[PDB]
Amino acid sequence: VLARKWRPQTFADVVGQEHVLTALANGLSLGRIHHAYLFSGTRGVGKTSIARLLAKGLNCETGITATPCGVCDNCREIEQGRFVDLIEIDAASRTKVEDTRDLLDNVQYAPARGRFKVYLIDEVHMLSRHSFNALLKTLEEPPEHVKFLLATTDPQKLPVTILSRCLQFHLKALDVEQIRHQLEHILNEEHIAHEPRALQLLARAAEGSLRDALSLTDQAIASGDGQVSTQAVSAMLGT
Ligand SMILES: Nc1ncnc2c1ncn2[C@@H]1O[C@H](COP(=O)(O)OP(=O)(O)OP(O)(O)=S)[C@@H](O)[C@H]1O
Ligand SMILES: [Zn+2]
Numbered sequence: 001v002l003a004r005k006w007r008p009q010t011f012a013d014v015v016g017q018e019h020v021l022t023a024l025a026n027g028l029s030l031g032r033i034h035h036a037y038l039f040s041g042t043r044g045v046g047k048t049s050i051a052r053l054l055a056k057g058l059n060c061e062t063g064i065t066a067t068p069c070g071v072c073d074n075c076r077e078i079e080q081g082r083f084v085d086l087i088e089i090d091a092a093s094r095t096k097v098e099d100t101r102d103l104l105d106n107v108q109y110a111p112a113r114g115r116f117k118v119y120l121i122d123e124v125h126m127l128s129r130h131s132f133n134a135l136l137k138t139l140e141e142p143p144e145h146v147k148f149l150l151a152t153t154d155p156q157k158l159p160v161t162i163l164s165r166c167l168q169f170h171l172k173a174l175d176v177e178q179i180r181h182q183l184e185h186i187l188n189e190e191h192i193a194h195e196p197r198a199l200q201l202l203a204r205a206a207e208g209s210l211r212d213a214l215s216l217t218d219q220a221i222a223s224g225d226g227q228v229s230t231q232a233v234s235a236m237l238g239t
Contacts, residue, residue, distance in 0.1 A: 002214040006186055008049040016178045017046050020169040025066035028057050034167045036139055036148040040155040041171030044211025051120050051149040055086050059114035074114050085114040092123035104134045109143045117146045124150040125157035132159050139165040173208030197230035205237050
């Protein structure tokens with residue numbers, strides 16, 4: 001679907017989180033790396049995308065950069081989600097509760113391939129109290145070669161002892177114009193027909209989320225004869 005196909009592959013592909021992208025790039029470019037990053041914000045605004053690019057910028061074979069090359073093996077594997085040094089943890093999953101608990105109790109201090117062992121934790125506020133302390137403990141005695149990239153829609157639900165040990169970045173819900181322009185850009189690249197009004201209606205219905213925006217666009221295309229027209233979208237949205 002559009003959402004997976006148009007996942008940001010470079011900071012330049014990211015829509016509207018400038019204040020965050022400028023700080024991450026400055027830090028990366030000057031070799032100033034903190035041990036833990038926290039990305040907060042609502043739904044589908046780009047938290048995981050940015051965390052993933054940061055992990056990519058940190059392990060690029062080309063060197064620590066704010067512009068991962070995107071063609072080296074480390075970059076390709078991270079992209080595929082099959083990189084040995086990018087350990088993805090989902091605190092919100094009912095199914096991976098043990099793996100979540102175990103991996104955090106057994107941090108692998110030495111990367112096997114890349115220069116850093118990276119942990120990316122989704123919805124970190126949903127971790128058990130046990131794991132919170134496991135994490136805290138690691139953030140208190142920062143293993144080198146190991147970086148923690150946390151994401152969450154509710155930073156406040158997080159123990160202040162942990163929040164305090166991260167570099168916090170607050171992502172904003174995206175503007176109607178920010179979303180509208182991205183949809184237009186994507187549809188132009190896909191060579192899919194669209195009408196101005198139709199895109200305005202989808203951007204508005206997305207209500208701040210680029211992911212919901214792409215999901216609504218994919219539904220529009222599928223139910224509207226392989227195109228995005230004002231008439232078909234209005235009917236679909238109940239305009
Ligand atoms: N700022 C953005 N710029 C460009 N595309 C984006 C942006 N935010 C979201 N997208 C699209 O939305 C999809 C999901 O975005 P994510 O980065 O996973 O959002 P998120 O903020 O982590 O959302 P959750 O998991 O619901 S909290 C991506 O694969 C993109 O196609
Ligand atoms: Zn690379």
